[PDB]
DNA sequence: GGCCCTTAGGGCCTT
DNA sequence: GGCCCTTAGGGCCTT
C-alpha cells in the first residue's frame, strides 16, 4: 500500500449497467494533490471549497453499442448526439490524453470513484485493455462506498444520499457534476478517508476487466 | 478560410502583463462542437446553459520566473502553492495532453480567447515554441474583443466583465479563475452565437500566422 | 503593443 | 456481481 500524493476523482457515464455490456460515454477526472486534502480550503462563511490548484479533464465519447432506456435519461447523452458532435469512441486519443493528464500529476496516484470496485474501475479497465493501454504501476484505487460504510461502525450510502446528510442541501445536476459532489464528500471526511486509502488502497494492476472485448 | 467545426474556448492565467515576459500558470479549454453553438440551449429560468457534449481541460503549472504582486493576487496562485501541489512547468506532459485533447476534437479547430490576439494567443505560441510543439494546421484563431466591437458597428466597455453585466445583467461566479473565465466567455459567445459564428467563418486568423509574445 | 475615440491626448484590454 | 442483511432469501450500489 504505497502513499498516494495525488488523488484523482473520477466518474463514468455509460450506456447502462454491467449487463449491457456498457461503454464509457463521458469520462471526468478531478486531480487534487494530497496537500489540499490534508488542510482543506474554506470560505469566509466558511463552507467547504474545492482546491485552487485543481487539474481537470473531461472527454465525451460515442459508444459502439446504443444506450439503454434509463441510462440515456439520466445522462442526457444519445449515441447520435455524441456522433453529431464528432466525438469518436474510446480510442487511442483518449488514452494519450488520459495518460498525459495523469502524467501531469505527482505520483503515486490514487483513483477515487464512488462504488468504483463494482463499476467505474472495472468499466475503465475493459476500455483500457482493449487498446492495450496501461496506467502507471504504482497507481492505487479507493472506493468511497466500502470506506465510508466501514468507518461509520438502517442507513443509506448512495452518492446523492451521502451528500444530503453531510451537506444539508442537495447536489447540482453530468459526469463532472458527480465528481464534484464526490470530491466534496471526500473533503468532509478527508483525514479519515486519507487514512483508509493509505491502508486499503487496491493496486490498479489488480483490477479485473468487467467484460472481455 | 477553413469552416471551423469545433470551437475551443480558452483562457490563461499568467504571471503578469506582456511587458514582464509572463509565463502560463494555468490553462483551461472548453471544447464545443459547432452544432451546439448553432442551437444555444437555455434553462427554464431561462438563462443560457452550457452544451451537454462538452470537453474540458484544466492544467495548473508552476512558472519559472515569479508572479507579480497583482498577478498572484487576482489568480489566487503562487509559485509556492503550485510547487506545493507538485506541479511542474510547461513541459512535454502539457503538450502531449493538450495535443491529445485537441486531436479528440473534430477539425478544423477554432481557438477562442477574449483579447486573444493581444495576450492569450501569442503567449500560448511562445510556450509552445520553446518545446518545439505546434497545434495542428487548418486551425484558426477567433478574438471576441474586436469581433463584438466590429459587430456593434452595424448600428462602452468591452471587457469580459462588462460584457457579462451588459448581456446578462448578473455577476460571474469565479473571477480570474481560468475555468471560470472560459465559462464566462462561452456564455457571452452563445448570446451572440449566430453573429460570432459568421465572424469566425468570414475572418478568423490562422494559428500558423500567430507571432510569439517573446523568444527565450 | 495595438486598436479605440472625441489635441503628438487619453485610455482600453489582457494578468 | 460483490456484499451485508435475517418454495436456491433480497436489497443495496453504480448507469
Ligand atoms: Mg459513478
Ligand atoms: Mg455519473
Ligand atoms: Mg483572459
Ligand atoms: Mg482569466
Residue numbers in the entry:
A (entry chain A): 4 to 156, 167 to 186, 189 to 228
B (entry chain B): 4 to 158, 168 to 228
Give the published text:
The three prime repair exonuclease 2 (TREX2) is an essential 3′-to-5′ exonuclease that functions in cell proliferation, genome integrity and skin homeostasis maintenance. TREX2 belongs to the family of DEDDh exonuclease, which was named after the four invariant acidic residues and one general base residue in the active site, consisting of more than 17 000 members involved in various DNA and RNA metabolism pathways. The exonuclease activity of TREX2 is responsible for removing the 3′-mismatched sequence of duplex DNA and is associated with cell proliferation and DNA repair. In this study, we present four new crystal structures: apo-TREX2, TREX2 in complex with two different dsDNA substrates, and TREX2 in complex with a processed dsDNA product.
To confirm the molecular mechanism for TREX2 precise trimming the 3′-overhang of duplex DNA, we determined a structure of TREX2–duplex DNA complex at a resolution of 2.7 Å. The DNA-binding mode of a duplex DNA with 3′-overhang bound by TREX2 is similar to that of Y-shaped DNA. Based on the superposition of the two structures of TREX2–substrate complexes, we observed that the regions of double-stranded and 3′-overhang in the two DNAs are thoroughly overlapped. The active sites of TREX2 in the complex also adopt an active form structure. In the structure of mTREX2–duplex DNA complex, the gap between the last base at the double-stranded region of duplex DNA (G1 base) and the Leu20-Pro21-Asn22 cluster of TREX2 is filled up by a base at the loop region of symmetric duplex DNA. This binding mode is similar to that of Y-shaped DNA bound by TREX2 in the TREX2-Y-shaped DNA structure as shown in Figure 4C. Therefore, for duplex DNA and Y-shaped DNA substrates containing a short 3′-overhang, the pattern of specific interactions is similar between TREX2 and the terminal of duplex DNA, including 5′-end capping by the Leu20-Pro21-Asn22 cluster. In both cases, a duplex DNA without 3′-overhang is the expected final product consistent with the nuclease activity assay. Our determined crystal structures of mTREX2-Y-shaped DNA complex and mTREX2–duplex DNA complexes, clearly showed the Leu20-Pro21-Asn22 cluster is responsible for stacking with the 5′-end of duplex DNA to control the precise trimming process.
